[PDB]
Amino acid sequence: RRDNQPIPPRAMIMSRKYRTLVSSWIEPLQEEAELGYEIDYLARYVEEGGLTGERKRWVPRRGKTPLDPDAAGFIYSNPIETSFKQRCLEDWKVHHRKLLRTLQSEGLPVLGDASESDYMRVMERLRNIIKGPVDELICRIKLHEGDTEFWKRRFLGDWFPEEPFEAFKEMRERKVFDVSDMYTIADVWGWTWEKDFKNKTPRRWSQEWEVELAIVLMAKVIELGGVPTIGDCAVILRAAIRAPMPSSFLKILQTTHSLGYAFGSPLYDEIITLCLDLGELDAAIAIVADMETTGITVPDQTLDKVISARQSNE
Amino acid sequence: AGAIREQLADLDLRIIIENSLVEWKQLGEEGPTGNEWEDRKIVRRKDFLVRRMELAKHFIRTNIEPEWMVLCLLPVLPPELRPIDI
Amino acid sequence: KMDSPTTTSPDAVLVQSMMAKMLHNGTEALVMEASPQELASGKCDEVDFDIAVFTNLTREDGTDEEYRDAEAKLFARMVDPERHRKVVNIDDPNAAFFVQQGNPDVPVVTFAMENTKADVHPLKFELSLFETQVLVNTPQGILEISSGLLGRHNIYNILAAVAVGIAVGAPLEDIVRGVEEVDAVPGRCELIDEEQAFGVIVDHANTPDGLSRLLDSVRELKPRRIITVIGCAGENERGKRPVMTKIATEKSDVTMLTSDNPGNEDPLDILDDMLSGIGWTMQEYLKHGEHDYYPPLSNGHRLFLHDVRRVAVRCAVAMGEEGDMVVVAGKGHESYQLEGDKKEFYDDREECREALQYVDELHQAGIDTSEFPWRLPESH
């Protein structure tokens, strides 16, 4: 967007099940959306040159050509499909796995003011945080990955000395290795931003967080010329349903209707109910307001009860 | 050998890399088992998986088909090189 | 039989040639399907028709009213008002239009399920998976029939057959013999019954309309389940392949996608187009094959595909329990399987005949042929 570079069609590669990258990361992976109306597979067959021209057939054929069109030109294959929730877990696992290794290396001095019994307490939680289905002393376990200056200080303090710390002293006087040779790519190239991207505790995945990111980039895909499909809008809407989050229903639908997409009436019945099932009639009026302006016929089952629910609070 | 050759042809080399990697990742997730014999075998399996995916990664980056390990034609040495043992 | 060139409508001069040949041997009666294009093209110009029969007009096969009068030229041939006869079906709304054609003074025999005013109407009819029994009220008297034609869609033909006998004044007893004698028309909802607990139906349906009309025409027979074997031709009418699967998977409980006439096209590619109707893909189907479990559809129906035709029709036969119904489609009477360019001899009637013969031996060997992943005694 900063360089006004439109999203290439290769980036907007139409995967199977008709879910682009705008919704391919949501929890239902390779699963169809929940549009109110039934799918129109006959139309999909027609639009994919299936009549006479050609169709991208998913028959697995013997050979080393990748069947998946998304794998075209990678080198080996696409990265293995993982959801945003799964990716958050791995970052959550690996961060605490690094904490355990750092804790295991020192134990007492890293904690400093903790007791030996607490050292086991801060281990079992770390052990349980990993592979898992209080004083929380873990906050003081500081990881220094990529901090060149930190490691140089620890490096400073016929046969080489047995003690590793004394061995480091021998190298500097014998010119085997010194701090001048101790550098990485980040600092020599002025990657200042790299400092604040690794030694941070990852935020655990939240469904309300996922839809916030879903609506943020969906608009950004629109700004760059990308056109998310009808299935993409349904999937992100459904993620906004599993968690209640009634506030984001309006902004999802107006963006969906801005592309000409119209959800099925039974889905519209489901969403209107959820917008007043838990008692959130506020913002449950605009959902039925703008959808009429766009030209969508609201079923009378919802209209009668929403009006009945309208006078219920009165 | 027909079973092997067809099985080699049927191999999805992309899939072999994917499932071996996650299986290899899973084995190291548990970590130590407290038994030397069990830890002995977990090393063998992990090295087997690494060797397997390394073999697969080489096949798809070159023009060598794994079916060729099971030959249906046998070349014959020129007569001059085998005058009258082989 | 004989093997004259059956290439659409034969040449008009050529058409009359074998009419001399059959008359040369001494043939007395002649009957032929009055194809709408055949008489419109003028192939039957000097043919002296005697009895005109109008089964029904649906126009699902172009013009709307011109097609109506195109068929009326068959009755426009009818000039003689006293000797030759007309037969019409009142249930079709166009019968009044058809009867006006030609000489109005021609005697007409009228048959219909409804409109009890008809000359021949069914007093009582019963539908069974192996036979159909109908009591018909002819003008001469009440007649009872019981033939191998299944479904009400052929009761029109049965009603027409007895009505024609009334038109030629056939004795009632002799009409029973003629109707009872016919039990299997090749490829037209043909029932092949080797004395088993569930009938096998061989049909020529290959179009979305023909298949849909057939499948709901067998549900009225009250079967336990419907098993369908449906294929599509290669490199031709590829725009109907998803439609066939959608219709079959809804009407039928168990569907068996197969290769009908692959030709130069890959048989698996044709099946992949079929799976597009349900949103499945050949790759996804084979993944379930690894797990030895094919999930049921959304409605709860089963989808089992196999590219090889011979091992598919026989497999579907073994998949039928008591009360089920197995129907094959796309071939009918055509005894050839077009693979590449060679026309390998393949007849579905022989396949179902032999499959019923050896299905018992498969069950007596412990083979569980209920779902597609057969469970042999040594399995799992």
XYZ file of C-alpha atoms in Angstrom, chain A residues 16 41-42 45 49-55 57-61 67, chain C residues 238 242-243 265-266 268-269 272-273 276-277 279-281 283-284 286:
34
model
C -9.917 -25.338 -3.609
C -21.215 -26.427 -7.796
C -22.742 -26.511 -11.281
C -17.945 -26.176 -12.958
C -13.938 -23.745 -18.304
C -15.493 -27.113 -17.542
C -17.866 -27.127 -20.509
C -15.493 -27.414 -23.461
C -12.307 -25.445 -22.881
C -10.480 -27.011 -19.926
C -10.773 -27.618 -16.180
C -8.609 -31.355 -12.564
C -7.504 -32.547 -9.125
C -6.682 -36.087 -10.285
C -3.360 -37.063 -8.662
C -1.146 -38.113 -11.557
C -0.863 -31.111 -8.430
C -18.783 -32.299 -20.830
C -21.524 -32.392 -12.578
C -25.294 -32.422 -13.119
C -10.019 -38.726 -22.510
C -8.637 -39.994 -19.218
C -10.220 -40.471 -14.003
C -10.553 -36.957 -15.433
C -13.172 -35.700 -11.483
C -15.689 -33.601 -13.407
C -17.231 -31.360 -9.006
C -21.016 -31.621 -8.778
C -17.663 -30.441 -4.419
C -15.464 -33.516 -4.077
C -12.235 -34.114 -5.969
C -7.612 -36.504 -4.842
C -9.914 -36.116 -1.839
C -8.457 -41.307 -2.830
